[PDB]
A paper describes a structure:
MTs are polymers built from αβ-tubulin heterodimer, which has seven known pharmacologically active sites. The interaction of compounds with these sites mediate MTs’ stabilization (MT stabilizing agents, MSAs) or prevent MTs’ assembly (MT destabilizing agents, MDAs). Instead, MDAs prevent the curved-to-straight structural change necessary for the assembly into MTs (colchicine, vinca, and gatorbulin sites). Finally, we further delved into the molecular mechanism of action of Mebendazole by combining biochemical and structural studies to obtain crystallographic high-resolution information of the Mebendazole-tubulin complex, which provided insights into the mechanisms of differential toxicity between helminths and mammalians.
Therefore, we next sought detailed structural information of the interaction of MBZ with tubulin using two different macromolecular complexes: T2R-TTL, which is made of two αβ-tubulin heterodimers in complex with one molecule of the stathmin-like domain of RB3 and one molecule of the tubulin tyrosine ligase; and the other, T1D, which includes one αβ-tubulin heterodimer and a synthetic ankyrin repeat protein, DARPin. We solved the structures of the T2R-TTL-MBZ and T1D-MBZ complexes and the electron densities refined to 2.20 Å and 2.33 Å resolutions, respectively. We found βII tubulin isotype in the T2R-TTL complex, and βIII tubulin isotype in the T1D complex. The βII- and βIII-tubulin isotypes share an overall sequence identity of 91% with a single difference at the MBZ binding site, where residue 241 (helix H7) is a Cys (βII) or a Ser (βIII). We unequivocally found MBZ ligand density in chains B of T1D and T2R-TTL complexes, and at chain D of T2R-TTL the density of the ligand was less defined, which correlated with the presence of partial electron density for the βT7 loop. In both structures, MBZ occupies the central pocket of the colchicine domain, as well as a zone buried deeper in β-tubulin and facing the β-sheet of the nucleotide-binding domain, similarly to the binding mode of NOC showing very similar interactions with β-tubulin, which supports the overall similar binding affinity measured. In our two structures, MBZ occupies zones 2 and 3 and does not contact the α-tubulin T5 loop (which is in a ‘closed’ conformation) and establishes extended interactions with β-tubulin N-terminal (strands S5 and S6) and intermediate (helix H7, H8 and strands S8, S9) domains. Hydrophobic interactions between the benzimidazole moiety and several residues, including L248 (T7 loop), L255 (helix H8), A316 (strand S8), and A354 (strand S9), are closely similar to those found on NOC. However, there are subtle differences specially on the hydrogen bonding interactions. These interactions are established by residues of N167 on S5 and E200 on S6 with the carbamate region (as shown with NOC) and additional residues depending on β-tubulin isotype.
Author numbering:
A (entry chain B): 2 to 42, 45 to 280, 285 to 360, 369 to 441
B (entry chain F): 13 to 167
C (entry chain A): 1 to 37, 47 to 435
């Protein structure tokens, strides 16, 4: 039933705040916690993300974490900033300086226990805890370094709970800091072993969408986060609203993850809109299979789909949906592995998102995601070959062979995808 | 030894401690264990004022470490645009190849330093230079779908 | 008067049990509160207040579905202690339903069943409703069947099993669960009536003019067929008067205990003035594949047994004449070691249809239960989907992580291979 949300670091807290603004509006929740909605459907599954306080007040089951005090002040200044439980703000004083080592072994380790005490308090309150949800970047130090430390500590305490992450992947197009490949490679190692699902939210792709499709000369983090919050809203639709699907996180992962290490998804969304600016079902179905709509800078046609889940939101003909979805598979039958029968599934929710009569969200488990990891591995290897900036990490206790291991594990993952990309039914 | 102290002073960016060490005869072209010189380290960590001072006093702009890395390789990898321009102005080999077959254009391409890419091209970067896997800088931009970089490499 | 206890496992079982007991009540003139202004005592106990209470248990590992029974029109009908729910479901994982989560509630389910059996003067056995694809309908059912064979060794056990169809399912692991539960249940079940959701789906579309059938559309049609299969147990007829007789008339060999059901006529409620179909017409429709519960071609197979269960205004002489015509048909080939004959039962009550359903009233209807080798085609389809996924070990880690050994996959698959061979050797 209940989900415990965590958001770590500057990026984690920023996209995490935007997620709560979006689904709160969908559920008709006031910035003070008061429900002021029209429909009863807005409340059926409200307990999944909201604790039901005394005065008919709904309080996000969210924990906010950061070694930087600044980002916490900015959350409260937001529209819904005072909706969060004050005691669920856990922040250090020093900051992470974009150093994965500082977040994972040094400052982060000093603060991780204080964070788990807050997680435990939220958990014991849950009737039947469904899983954990984390938002964070992989290129920084707090979200990447301390986020993955949090995941492994949460995995120890709650081994039988699902752990999904919305992980933002670094791109030179968004932040120029050149240690991000280090931080992301060290983190992806952690995610491969300790998360059940990971949504690859690639800043490369977010920028390209804004810059080339939405024609935004200079995309801001708000332009990028508009795409992220809309994606996260659709990805969690089946959990938050009544409809065909009644599945918990565990059931959603069981049918999407054929292999334990291949749980990194390509999320997509249609239509793509800029902040403040209706498609047919065929135009919706075509768009979300189109490379331009992917939130991970990968071309699906360069790989093969293992599993695909799509959720349509709005009032629309289910039959027309079934036919279009059928139209794509048979037309592109080669891009879907033939050794997982019926691997493309569809769901519909009559309640559309804010400002749209029609929308659809795409969740792909595609071998083409290896293009993302090969891009990071290439940058990682360019820096690591020249040993540039390693002192920042070895000075924080890290061993140098941790870098070789992360690189090695990164490439084993790439090889796994390529293995199943070439396998046949025979 | 004054060479080790000039190396460390150039890494940390201590401008004043560089000229003092150079005032007591510090080897401007001193090498560490891996063959890096003060100019390698100042260019790696964005210390422009030390880069220019070293070049005014006998620094080999095209010195190479054990792995064949020149100062321009490192400045291009890390993204220091001004340092890249100074080095070229003082005769940096725009097409120096290291032990991995990489040229400064390769490393600027890999790391998405588009401004450096353009500068290197304007100074004669070889678009046909192949690394030890056969990739040119344009191959790298196609393989990782970098449309912005590919357009730059085609003009 | 020998009692029968119905057990409904998982969402599919529960929701189909709802439609069945809904229909049972109407056929015996029982109100939703059990009040009534003899024969049906086999399925309904009788209290001192005159309340007729189903001899039924509903079991699910999460409470969403059974909670609607506890608040629907029939909240008064059932024993409340016979509506049993856990809090966390099997996540479409056979292993969860059988090994980890299922074992946390099995003892309670048995004690509640014992309570019902203690009120039986001569318990015949159990009717078990469940899906193949669900983790509860598969894993917990096979666990329940194993435990019932130990505690009720002499009693008979019948299954109504929902065979998976991609058109109305969002799970990809259903082939696994389907073979796993069949393997471990085969030896503990005396007779099993499989319901192919695709067959019910096509019937709802072709005969009932329903473009997008819901689970309610399917279940009302399914319950109409279950009712006609169990009618003999509730109306003191001549044919199949006790559970033991199902096996005698339909199962010449214990492993080949999957009879094919064919029901006719299915007419849309919009055609309230259709010309009534003769006995000969509805009988010939029992040999049209389009009316069968499992999709397969009996013309390829051979009959080992054949029962015709008529309901309504049916004169025995017209049945003998219609069968006389059927025996000339070349498509109907019996095995050489069986009486080439049809066991006939007639229930002169006019068929009942639920108010709110999609079926027109008819004066006469029939259900043919036949044990044909052709149903092995339905096993072949499942076995093939199983083979494609298990060749790459896809999804297997989900099961191994829930108290199951990988060897059980191949052990179950070999059992299926031996079952297909059993059909070939007949
Ligand atoms: N005919 C029919 N089929 C159903 C119904 N509900 C679910 N199914 C089918 O059953 C399969 C899914 O398994 P469920 O029965 O829903 O799962 P479960 O037994 O509750 O076990 P869990 O995995 O723990 O949820 C799919 O093939 C569905 O198409 C129903 O009401 N009627
Ligand atoms: N989309 C998005 N990405 C961000 C945001 N803030 C930082 N990032 C990315 O995250 C990386 C920097 O990590 P950051 O979260 O700032 O470090 P941390 O605070 O220590 O966890 C860079 O790749 C940034 O592009 C944001 O608001 N939105
Ligand atoms: C907080 O973390 C998550 O929300 N994780 C997550 N995983 C998912 C997988 C699938 C879906 C669907 O919408 C769906 C659509 C059609 C058929 C089946 C499922 C939704 C998911 N959400
Ligand atoms: Cl579907
Ligand atoms: Cl006969
Ligand atoms: Mg269920």
């Amino acid at each position: 039933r209940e989900i415990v949300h965590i958001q770590a670091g500057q990026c984690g807290n920023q996209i995490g705040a935007k997620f709560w603004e979006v689904i709160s509006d969908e559920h008709g929740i006031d910035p003070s916690g008061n429900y002021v909605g029209d429909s009863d459907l807005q409340l059926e599954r409200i307990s999944v993300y909201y604790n039901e306080a005394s005065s008919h007040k709904y309080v996000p089951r969210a924990i906010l974490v950061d070694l930087e005090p600044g980002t916490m002040d900015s959350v409260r200044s937001g529209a819904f900033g005072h909706l969060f439980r004050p005691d669920n703000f856990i922040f250090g004083q020093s900051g992470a300086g974009n150093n994965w080592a500082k977040g994972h072994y040094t400052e982060g380790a000093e603060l991780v226990d204080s964070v788990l005490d807050v997680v435990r308090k939220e958990c014991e309150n849950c009737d039947c805890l469904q899983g954990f949800q984390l938002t964070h970047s992989l290129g920084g130090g707090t979200g990447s370094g301390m986020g993955t430390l949090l995941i492994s500590k949460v995995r120890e305490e709650y081994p039988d709970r699902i752990m999904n992450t919305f992980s933002v992947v670094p791109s030179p197009k968004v932040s120029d800091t050149v240690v991000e490949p280090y931080n992301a490679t060290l983190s992806i190692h952690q995610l491969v072993e300790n998360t059940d699902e990971t949504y690859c939210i690639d800043n490369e792709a977010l920028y390209d969408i804004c810059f080339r499709t939405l024609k935004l000369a200079t995309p801001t983090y708000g332009d990028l986060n508009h795409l992220v919050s809309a994606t996260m809203s659709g990805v969690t639709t089946s959990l938050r609203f009544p409809g065909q699907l009644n599945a918990d996180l565990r059931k959603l992962a069981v049918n999407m993850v054929p292999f334990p290490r291949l749980h990194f998804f390509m999320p997509g969304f249609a239509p793509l809109t800029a902040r403040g600016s209706a498609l047919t079902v065929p135009e919706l179905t075509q768009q979300m299979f189109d490379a331009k709509n992917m939130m991970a800078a990968c071309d699906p046609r360069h790989g093969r789909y293992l599993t695909v889940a799509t959720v349509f939101r709005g009032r629309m003909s289910m039959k027309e949906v079934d036919e279009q979805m059928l139209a794509i598979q048979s037309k592109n039958s080669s891009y879907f592995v033939e050794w997982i029968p019926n691997n493309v599934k569809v769901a519909v929710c009559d309640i559309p998102p804010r400002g749209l009569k029609m929308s659809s969200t795409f969740i792909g488990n595609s071998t083409a995601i290896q293009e993302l990891f090969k891009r990071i591995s290439e940058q990682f290897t360019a820096m690591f070959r020249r040993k540039a900036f390693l002192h920042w990490y070895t000075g924080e206790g890290m061993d140098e062979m941790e870098f070789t291991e992360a690189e090695s594990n990164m490439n084993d993952l790439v090889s796994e995808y390529q293995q199943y990309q070439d396998a046949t039914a025979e | 030894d004054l060479g080790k102290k000039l190396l460390e002073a150039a890494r940390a960016g201590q401008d004043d401690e560089v000229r003092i060490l150079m005032a007591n005869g510090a080897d401007v072209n001193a090498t560490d264990a891996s063959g890096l010189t003060p100019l390698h380290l100042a260019a790696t960590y964005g210390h422009l004022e030390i880069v220019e001072v070293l070049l005014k006093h006998g620094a080999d702009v095209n010195a190479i470490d054990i792995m064949g890395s020149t100062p321009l390789h490192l400045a291009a990898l890390i993204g220091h645009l001004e340092i890249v321009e100074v080095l070229l102005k003082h005769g940096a080999d725009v097409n120096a190849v290291d032990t991995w077959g990489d040229t400064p254009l390769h490393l600027a391409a890999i790391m998405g330093h588009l401004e450096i890419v353009e500068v290197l091209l304007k100074h004669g970067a070889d678009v046909n230079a192949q690394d030890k896997f056969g990739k040119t800088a344009f191959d790298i931009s196609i393989d990782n779908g970098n449309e912005d970089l590919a357009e730059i490499l085609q003009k | 008067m020998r009692e029968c206890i119905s057990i409904h496992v998982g969402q599919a079982g529960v929701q189909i049990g709802n439609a069945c007991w809904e229909l049972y009540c109407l056929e015996h003139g029982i109100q939703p509160d059990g009040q009534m202004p003899d024969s049906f005592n086999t399925f309904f106990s009788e209290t001192g207040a005159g309340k007729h209470v189903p001899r039924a248990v509903f079991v699910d590992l999460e409470p969403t579905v059974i909670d609607e029974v506890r608040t629907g029109t029939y909240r008064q009908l059932f024993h409340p202690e016979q509506l049993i729910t856990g809090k966390e479901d099997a996540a479409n994982n056979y292993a969860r339903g059988h090994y980890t989560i299922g074992k946390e509630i099995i003892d309670l389910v048995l004690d509640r069943i014992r309570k019902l059996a203690d009120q039986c003067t001569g318990l015949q056995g159990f009717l078990v409703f469940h899906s193949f694809g669900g983790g509860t309908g598969s894993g917990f059912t096979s666990l329940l069947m194993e435990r019932l064979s130990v505690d009720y060794g002499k009693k008979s056990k019948l299954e109504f099993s929902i065979y998976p169809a991609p058109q109305v399912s969002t799970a990809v692991v259903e082939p696994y669960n389907s073979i796993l539960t069949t393997h471990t249940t085969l030896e503990h079940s005396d007779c099993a009536f499989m319901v192919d959701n695709e067959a019910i789906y096509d019937i709802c579309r072709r005969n009932l003019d329903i473009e997008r059938p819901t689970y309610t559309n399917l279940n009302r049609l399914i319950s109409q067929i279950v009712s006609s299969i169990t009618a003999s147990l509730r109306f003191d007829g001549a044919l199949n008067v006790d559970l033991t007789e199902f096996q005698t008339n339909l199962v010449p060999y214990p492993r080949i205990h999957f009879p094919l059901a064919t029901y006719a006529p299915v007419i849309s409620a919009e055609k309230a003035y259709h010309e009534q179909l003769s006995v000969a017409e509805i009988t010939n429709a029992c040999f049209e594949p389009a009316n069968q519960m499992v999709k397969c071609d009996p013309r390829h197979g051979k009959y080992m047994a054949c029962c015709l269960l008529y309901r309504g205004d049916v004169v025995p002489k017209d049945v003998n004449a219609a069968i006389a015509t059927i025996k000339t048909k070349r498509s109907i080939q019996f095995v050489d070691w069986c009486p080439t004959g049809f066991k006939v039962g007639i229930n002169y009550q006019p068929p009942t249809v639920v108010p709110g359903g999609d079926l027109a009233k008819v004066q006469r209807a029939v259900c043919m239960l036949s044990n044909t080798t052709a149903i092995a085609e339905a096993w072949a389809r499942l076995d093939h989907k199983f083979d494609l996924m298990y060749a790459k070990r896809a999804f297997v880690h989900w099961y191994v992580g829930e108290g199951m050994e990988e060897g059980e996959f191949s052990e179950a698959r070999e059992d299926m291979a031996a079952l297909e061979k059993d059909y070939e050797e007949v």
